[PDB]
Design a protein around this ligand. Structure first.
Ligand SMILES: Nc1cccc(-c2cccnc2)c1
Ligand SMILES: [Cl-]
Ligand SMILES: [Cl-]
Ligand SMILES: [Cl-]
Ligand SMILES: [Cl-]
Ligand SMILES: [Mn+2]
Length: 340
């Protein structure tokens, strides 16, 4: 039967089923007030699917100059064409290769650049903004979005949206690597999975993806969305409550010291955006510091709501196109205040 919602993370994560329901706020707001992330499924069914394909981005924008990042070593690949990224998104034999001759796992950096998304892509901007869930919170002019209503005593988000475009991590060695390392944002945000590319060439890469989700500490119900309904899994997230951010800093200061980094006692390993918490580090965080997180698998069409101040990291399982919009809810406005 079609139902309003369900739970993931053993009851700790709300999953809303109908992205456009007028009454979603009645279920959302208590979870949000408590500082929990929220998942909303089904957003892909509301979009114009032809606007969000890798072939279209290549055809329309392919001649632009860009930098890429090698996810395995964080090396910058300088001054290449946007088509060199997009043409290898799902076809492995077209990907740029490192000097060893292996195809690289790449991220498209700062594209579209800064705040140019709306100017460069006006039809995509309208398609995203009209179909965001919880529109009183997420629209630029929503009644519960304080972004346009606050004085300079508050850090205001940049004009978005932002795209997150990167290949899937492949190997057993790739399991300990981040697509995006651990960090936090002072604004709230909604991150939408608008396309998942499951490759061909090296195709039949199914079983390493299952071992990644298991070792990622995914709950038993999350494991059923694969085996039962065959949805396409895009990325593995870990998210931590904003209240746990300092205990995480204390752990990473200690591990930095153990690995022979030489760091002042006050330096900020979350702001540095240099760490990925692998299975070893997540178990140590739980055992030594008493901190538990949310392990979330974002499928095609899932929107992840990320609370202001909540540390989070992302590990792509397959090639992903994500689009995120920042907002300032009243529940979490304390996180962007510039005093005390
Ligand atoms: N049975 C059913 C099916 C679909 C949406 C809903 C719904 C969602 C959100 C709030 N109120 C109702 C209920
Ligand atoms: Cl467009
Ligand atoms: Cl709403
Ligand atoms: Cl990063
Ligand atoms: Cl909070
Ligand atoms: Mn982020």
């Amino acid at each position: 039967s079609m139902t309003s919602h369900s739970w993931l993370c053993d009851g700790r994560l709300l999953c809303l089923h109908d992205p456009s329901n007028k009454n979603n706020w009645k279920i959302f707001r208590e979870c949000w007030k408590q500082g929990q992330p929220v998942l909303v499924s089904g957003v892909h069914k509301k979009l114009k699917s032809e606007l969000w394909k890798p072939e279209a981005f290549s055809q329309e924008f392919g001649d632009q100059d860009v930098d890429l990042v090698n996810c395995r070593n964080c090396a910058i690949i300088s001054d290449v064409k946007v088509r060199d990224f997009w043409d290898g998104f799902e076809i492995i034999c077209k990907r740029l290769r490192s000097e060893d001759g292996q195809p690289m796992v790449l991220k498209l950096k700062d594209w579209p650049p800064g705040e140019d998304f709306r100017d460069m892509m006006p039809t995509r901007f309208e398609d995203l903004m009209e179909n965001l869930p919880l529109p009183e919170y997420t629209k630029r002019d929503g009644r519960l979005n304080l972004a346009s209503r606050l004085p300079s005593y508050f850090v205001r988000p940049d004009l978005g949206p932002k795209m997150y475009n990167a290949y899937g991590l492949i190997t057993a060695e790739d399991r300990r690597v981040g697509t995006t390392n651990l960090h936090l944002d002072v604004s709230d945000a909604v991150n939408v999975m608008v396309y998942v590319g499951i490759p061909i060439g090296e195709g039949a890469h199914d079983e390493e993806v299952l071992k990644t989700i298991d070792e990622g500490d995914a709950d038993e119900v999350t494991k059923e969305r694969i085996h039962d309904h065959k949805e396409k899994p895009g990325a593995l997230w870990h998210i931590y409550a904003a209240k746990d951010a300092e205990k995480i800093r204390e752990l990473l200061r200690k591990v930095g010291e153990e690995q022979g980094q030489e760091n002042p006692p006050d330096h900020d390993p979350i702001h540095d955006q240099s760490w990925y918490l692998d299975q070893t580090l997540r178990k140590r965080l739980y055992e030594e510091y008493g901190v538990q997180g949310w392990a979330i698998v974002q499928f095609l069409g899932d929107a992840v709501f990320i609370p202001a101040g909540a540390p989070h990291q992302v590990h792509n399982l397959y090639s992903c196109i994500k689009v995120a919009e920042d907002f300032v809810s009243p529940e979490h406005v304390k996180h962007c205040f510039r005093l005390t």
